[PDB]
């Protein structure tokens, strides 16, 4: 009777914690859960949906704080598992781990809006998102990668930044008196900062010849700039999961 | 007599079926016709370009449906030439073939539509450009590169979205009475997401001072986490094809 | 008096056929000359800026042909260095070549010109910047590295292609009556292909609830399909230049 | 005595030129008062955020003075540390250095401002941002990438330029008379580079049937082209980051 009990308990423990296969199926229908639960709040916050949307809303909060409630609960139960925590003490020493009190005070605060409100209900969904990850592996990741290319980012982002206000300077001396768009210097800025980023709302364009002949220029130099870093990042996880593919290859 | 048959058996064997290189010609060829036929159809909806459209949609539904024939009868004709199949058992085990049931369920449904017509007719010319592939290389490549690369491709989209979230809901505090464009909160989060993908359809944009200070900060940081996963895929695929280079080069 | 003659004709043979470092300089000026022909050609159809424009364009056109001039006879005069072509013969077996009686055409007729005017000048100018490789370089740069992808670019080209017709097909059934934006499907097609490649010019945006939730989830995963060629090759640039590094610090 | 004096002029050298790991800190600091006075500045040009502004801005810039004059002059203090620079003659001849004639410019300069006013003291405030280099790291480093490839660089200008001049033309046949957007040939040029750079403003689009078929196929072409550049560039910084890792874990 204690070996399918170990058995089932190690088999918890490794659904629960760190997951390898089939057991990202069950961690996915949680963040469906939780993610279905955030687009139904948003459509509660609309006058003429709001009927509908609570009415669903209702047994869907009733429904994620019972499963956010067994999953707690087994992991504290699965936690006497492992080789290190076992026992009373074992369980209530895993009870002293911070992020146990930060899952059971959202799980309790959870009750405590089901007993301004969906509002605080969707400020408790988000960061039960942010409870997600448990570890900070996506943090992790990308902090060992963006301090890896800390020179190119630094050197893109002080580049695309004086080709900005070059660019915004040049457009407004060009464009000051025959246009209501580039009234003040930061109507120039705020023109510079949406163009070179390609998105181009459009509330704010040139229109003389001045100023369409410089813009010409500077957003082909300046667009290039701000899509770097993206690029440097982009190449910098593609490379680093290729080197851990060959050094997995061999080990 | 036998020598010249089996011949040009495997030569229709090698065009039909996996290609290299002239034969291409071939299958781009096919692909115009149905490229073609989709275009024309399209043009065909509008109520002031339909006579033009379908006067010249008719016979060119009519050349599609014989090319496609006569592609079909000579795939199984020309799958005699393997040395699995090969007699009138062996062309019918060819029958069998599931892809082979899709095709000439196809082709027997536009007779079916040439005996809401053009809708069902543009969907039977879809389902043939996904009948293209037959091996689904497309899906493949892209399935084991996307597997590759999943630890960093959550983190984007994860990172990605609590800046969606952060950025959105920072604006909508700073412009929820003097701006009509952001009057709930999903009217920001439309605006953060046509903005972080650098779309800007410019029907929202924050006309404050407090939602442009802030929505400075948060474009620079967001565009670069939506436009991370493009670039790590595209890197992935440039580094795979690398090495089948070299992996080629030897062997 | 031969010594200082077929040393400067080799000088000026190496300037003028393949450069390596401060005869860049030269064609960068001759490029320079042809560019601000061409914006001042383009100054010149607009009503109001014709005269000032054309008053400088005579003497620009009449620079950039003598110059062209001097440069084409001293190219068949430099010819005599290499030890292939000299003497009359050899200089005149030159003038077999295909380009070299593209560029006289071209010569002889802006003299032609020069004896719907300024549209003829303008094709003129253009075709001497296709004239300015001589040797197809990026043509077969750009050939060789978009073949060697040919695999990842219509694996990246047929799912962004389902992908825009998925999208555009759903936000059409969801915005056909509540929206003058969405009337037929080719607007709905419209919309799709300037959304997905993050143009957004917003003169059809989708303004229903249902159209909203499709695109929202549609352009995620659409827009990355769309941004992958220009990574694919961008990658595929950067790693053939490194290898070709490695490969000329051995030899 | 001397002993705690050499000791504390080598850190000081060391946190004031090269530094390695928390003296970024104080870098970092003295950027964030130099950006808050260039934002400060900004609000200061706006009409009615003016009194707020500049009763900010006053105190300021005196701190930043104030900041910058302890900071050159432990400079000039703690040049002395280093083995050659050392005593008056020494410390004399660092004044001989050009960048610190240009940094002691500026500061007596905004000593003699603090004594059209707010526009010089923005432009000394950009000249500061420029003078944090003091080494034209950022500009070397994107020099030696962009120089390593300026083969691809250059074919992607060259192609992506002669794909908007078509598409240019193109569009402009198509929608001359139709359209008061294209009215002339220049209207359709800045309309191509707005597309062709993603950017999408809105306030020229094609409107007929002609030219957004000629506009679907050239904006999968051209947008690929300009997105070429900044992939480019990004792995190239990526590669060059990877083989100096790879060339600091042997040395």
Same mark, same amino acid.
């Given at each position: 009777? /204690?070996?399918?009990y170990?058995?089932? @308990?190690?088999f918890?423990?490794?659904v629960?914690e760190?997951?390898?296969?089939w057991?990202?199926?069950?961690?996915a229908?949680?963040?469906?859960?939780?993610?279905?639960?955030?687009? +139904?709040?948003?459509?509660?916050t609309? *006058?003429?949906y709001? *009927?509908?949307?609570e009415?669903?809303?209702?047994?869907l909060?009733?429904?994620?704080?019972?499963?956010? $409630?067994?999953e707690?609960?087994?992991?504290?139960?699965?936690? $006497?598992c492992?080789? #290190?925590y076992?026992?009373? #003490?074992?369980?209530?020493?895993?009870?002293?781990?911070?992020?146990?009190?930060?899952?059971?005070?959202? +799980?309790i605060?959870?009750?405590?809006?089901?007993?301004?409100?969906? #509002?605080s209900?969707?400020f408790l @969904?988000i960061?039960r998102?942010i409870?997600?990850?448990? #570890?900070?592996?996506?943090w992790k990741?990308?902090?060992?990668?963006?301090?890896?290319?800390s020179?190119?980012?630094?050197?893109?982002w002080?580049?695309?930044?004086?080709?900005?206000?070059?660019?915004?300077?040049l457009?407004? &001396?060009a464009?000051?008196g025959?246009?209501?768009?580039?009234?003040?210097?930061?109507?120039?800025?705020?023109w510079?900062?949406?163009?070179l980023?390609?998105?181009?709302?459009?509330?704010?364009?040139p229109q003389t010849? /001045?100023?369409?002949?410089?813009?010409?220029?500077?957003?082909?130099?300046?667009?290039?700039?701000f899509?770097?870093?993206?690029?440097? &990042?982009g190449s910098?996880?593609?490379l680093?999961?290729?080197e @851990?593919?060959?050094?997995k290859?061999?080990?």
């Amino acid at each position: 009777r /204690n070996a399918f009990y170990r058995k089932l @308990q190690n088999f918890l423990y490794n659904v629960l914690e760190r997951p390898r296969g089939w057991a990202f199926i069950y961690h996915a229908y949680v963040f469906l859960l939780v993610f279905s639960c955030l687009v +139904l709040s948003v459509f509660s916050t609309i *006058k003429e949906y709001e *009927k509908s949307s609570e009415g669903a809303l209702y047994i869907l909060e009733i429904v994620t704080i019972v499963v956010f $409630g067994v999953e707690y609960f087994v992991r504290i139960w699965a936690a $006497g598992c492992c080789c #290190r925590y076992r026992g009373w #003490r074992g369980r209530l020493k895993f009870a002293r781990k911070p992020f146990c009190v930060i899952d059971i005070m959202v +799980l309790i605060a959870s009750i405590a809006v089901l007993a301004s409100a969906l #509002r605080s209900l969707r400020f408790l @969904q988000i960061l039960r998102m942010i409870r997600m990850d448990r #570890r900070g592996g996506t943090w992790k990741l990308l902090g060992s990668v963006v301090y890896a290319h800390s020179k190119e980012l630094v050197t893109a982002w002080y580049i695309g930044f004086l080709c900005l206000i070059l660019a915004s300077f040049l457009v407004y &001396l060009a464009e000051k008196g025959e246009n209501d768009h580039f009234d003040t210097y930061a109507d120039a800025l705020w023109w510079g900062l949406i163009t070179l980023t390609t998105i181009g709302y459009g509330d704010k364009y040139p229109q003389t010849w /001045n100023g369409r002949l410089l813009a010409a220029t500077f957003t082909l130099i300046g667009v290039s700039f701000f899509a770097l870093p993206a690029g440097i &990042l982009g190449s910098g996880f593609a490379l680093k999961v290729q080197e @851990q593919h060959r050094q997995k290859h061999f080990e």
